[PDB]
Amino acid sequence: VNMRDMLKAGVHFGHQTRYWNPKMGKFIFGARNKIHIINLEKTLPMFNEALTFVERLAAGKNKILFVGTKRSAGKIVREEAARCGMPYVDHRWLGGMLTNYKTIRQSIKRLRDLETQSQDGTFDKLTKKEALMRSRDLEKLERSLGGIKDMGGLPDALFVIDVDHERIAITEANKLGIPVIGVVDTNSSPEGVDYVIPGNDDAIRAVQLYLNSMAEAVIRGKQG
RNA sequence: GCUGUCGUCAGCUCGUGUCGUGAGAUGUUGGGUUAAGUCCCGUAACGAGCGCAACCCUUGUCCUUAGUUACCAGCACCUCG
Ligand SMILES: [Mg+2]
Ligand SMILES: [Mg+2]
Ligand SMILES: [Mg+2]
Ligand SMILES: [Mg+2]
Ligand SMILES: [Mg+2]
Ligand SMILES: [Mg+2]
Ligand SMILES: [Mg+2]
Ligand SMILES: [Mg+2]
Ligand SMILES: [Mg+2]
């Protein structure tokens, strides 16, 4: 937005220059002190195009799955999940979540049953050597499946934050043929994603900006 | 049909998903721990079954129920059982 806040937060930065993908060469403005610099001129049109796509997809009661699992990055995804709804994941991505989704329906049902059982006035009124085990199993299931408790169907567009770190999700999203919105850094590969956002990673301010922009865009799209 | 043995050793597999042209692989590998594929943490795997364990019999402590053919603390007698 207006080239200033992005410059301030973290965007014009990359993953050194020893580690990089040649397919990113068209986005690099240059190198500064053995560190690559992202051309912020090219990223703004792509960012705005992603904004319009999310806004127009929101109008129609669809779902955007947010993938942000990373240190200090999945958390902000989780608190961004409140407001504008939409499913999310912030812990490890289970293998075959979008291709073996029929099986994971069963685990979601089990999570729902456990949540009903524990929070119906503490029905776990049995031996104390088993209530703790049941509660910790419930917490373990929650810690992975809580974000996607909703969305009985497949999402119509998957928003990822790091192509390389979460390549499994992008691969199976491509296999299912559903759009992918990704924030590609210098060391990652743009291949496999539809809309590319050549921005920085590993920056709390940057990811905060991206998630808040997504939230406001989807809110505007949802307002109709 | 019934039985021995490896061996009461902790192992043997399947559904869906993914990798390979294929036989196949992953799950079931890795760090710890346990009598145990026992458990935890991690992880293209998510789950489940047969096994392990518990549920059964006996032994050790105590409570309640009842005292005959069993028992004898208190009392009378005893021919002194
Ligand atoms: Mg097998
Ligand atoms: Mg199998
Ligand atoms: Mg298989
Ligand atoms: Mg094949
Ligand atoms: Mg084996
Ligand atoms: Mg095997
Ligand atoms: Mg091991
Ligand atoms: Mg077992
Ligand atoms: Mg047994």
DSSP string computed for A182-195: EEE-TTS--TT-SE
A25 Cβ contacts chain B strand, under 7 Å = no
DSSP class of residue A11? -
Q: Return the number of other C-beta atoms located less than 10 Å from residue A136's C-beta.
A: 10
| Residue bearing tokens 């990223």 | A43
Resolution value (Å, 1 decimal): 2.9
A96 Cβ contacts chain B strand, under 7 Å = yes
Helix H or strand E encompassing A160 = strand A157-160
- Strand B-proximal residues of A, range 106-165, CB below 7 A, are 106-107, 140-141
Residue A218, Cα to own-chain centre: how many angstroms? 14
Nucleotides of B under 7 A from a protein CB: 15-19, 41-47
A90 Cβ contacts chain B strand, under 7 Å = no
DSSP class of residue A83? S
| Three-state SS at A177 | coil
Residues forming a β-bridge with A42:
none
Strands A195-198 and A180-184 come out as parallel
Q: Which amino acid is at A35?
A: I
Cβ neighbours of residue A178 closer than 8 Å, sequence gap 6 or more: A98, A154, A155, A156, A157, A158
Q: How far is the CA of A183 from the C1' of B78 (A)?
A: 111
How far is Cα A70 from Cα A171, in angstroms, rounded to an integer?
18
> Ligand 4 centroid vs A40 CA: distance in angstroms?
42
A168 Cβ contacts chain B strand, under 7 Å = yes
CA angle A119, A121, A126 (to 5 degrees): 95
| Three-state SS at A113 | helix
Helical ranges in chain A per DSSP H: 5-9, 40-58, 74-81, 101-118, 128-145, 167-176, 204-223
Q: What is the CA radius of gyration of chain A?
A: 19
